[PDB]
Design a protein around this ligand. Structure first.
Ligand SMILES: N[C@@H](Cc1ccccc1)C(=O)O
Ligand SMILES: [Cl-]
Length: 243
């Protein structure tokens, strides 16, 4: 009876929407926690006297311990401060050293931090120091309007993947390039899987709008929404309304 089918559709739409939102919140909370951490670190560095900032040896001895404590506190992969002379004070998982051989001005995390007064968040990429995929939070640190350097904080992208995977629902994230990034169902990360139907249904319907689509001649229901540069989606079988 159409009344009963409508009731099932509305119920499942509510559940799946709710679960999509949980995945959205997971991504949001991950980012905001790492931004707050980065901002705190910025503040602690900039609150040092200038004397503690204006020689490289003072950077090593005064900023180094701060990088290291902060790194430990959140279990970050790397925490670093890059200077306009090309040197970088690097605290890496494994005494922070001032490294001259790391080409920092070619890095997006460095370049882009100088172009905004906000924290800059990179897409995930392979860290060259420890060769893990990371999300980098970078921030140009200023004291009295004077640049000190660019702070960077590397968090393993696996951390976010793991958080998403734990969420209820058949939820998943695409990155910026509409490549699959995270999923509750590990099998969805099989890289040969096409996601055109979901993506095309999302493009036709827009954020948070529940849609029907087909997989192997069978009906499925889903919704997607933008979360930062990611696309979060949920999908389920349509059996709940049909059977
Ligand atoms: N994850 C950073 C690590 C790094 C810091 C400082 C200099 C060089 C590299 C990167 O790969 O760019
Ligand atoms: Cl993030």
């Amino acid at each position: 009876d159409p009344f009963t089918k409508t009731s099932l559709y509305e119920s499942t739409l509510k559940n799946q929407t709710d679960l999509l939102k949980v995945t959205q919140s997971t991504v949001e909370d991950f980012r905001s926690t790492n931004q707050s951490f980065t901002r705190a670190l910025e503040k602690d560095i900039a609150n040092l006297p200038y004397q503690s900032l204006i020689t490289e040896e003072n950077i090593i001895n005064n900023v180094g311990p701060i990088l290291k404590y902060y790194r430990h506190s959140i279990n970050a992969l790397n925490v670093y401060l890059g200077l306009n002379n090309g040197k970088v004070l690097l605290s890496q998982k494994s005494m922070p050293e001032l490294r001259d051989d790391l080409d920092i001005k070619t890095k997006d995390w460095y370049q882009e931090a100088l172009k905004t007064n906000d924290i800059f968040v990179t897409p995930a990429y392979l860290d060259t120091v420890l060769k893990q995929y990371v999300i980098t939070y970078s921030k140009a640190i200023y004291k009295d309007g004077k640049i000190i350097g660019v702070l960077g904080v590397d968090i393993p992208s696996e951390d976010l993947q793991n958080l998403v995977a734990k969420t209820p629902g058949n939820t998943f994230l695409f990155d910026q390039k509409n490549k699959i990034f995270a999923a509750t169902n590990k099998e969805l990360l099989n890289p040969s899987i096409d996601h055109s139907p979901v993506l095309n249904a999302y493009k036709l319907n827009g954020d948070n709008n529940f849609f029907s689509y087909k997989l192997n001649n069978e009906e499925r229901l889903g919704a997607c929404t933008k979360v930062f540069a990611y696309t979060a989606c949920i999908t389920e079988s349509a059996d709940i309304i049909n059977k």
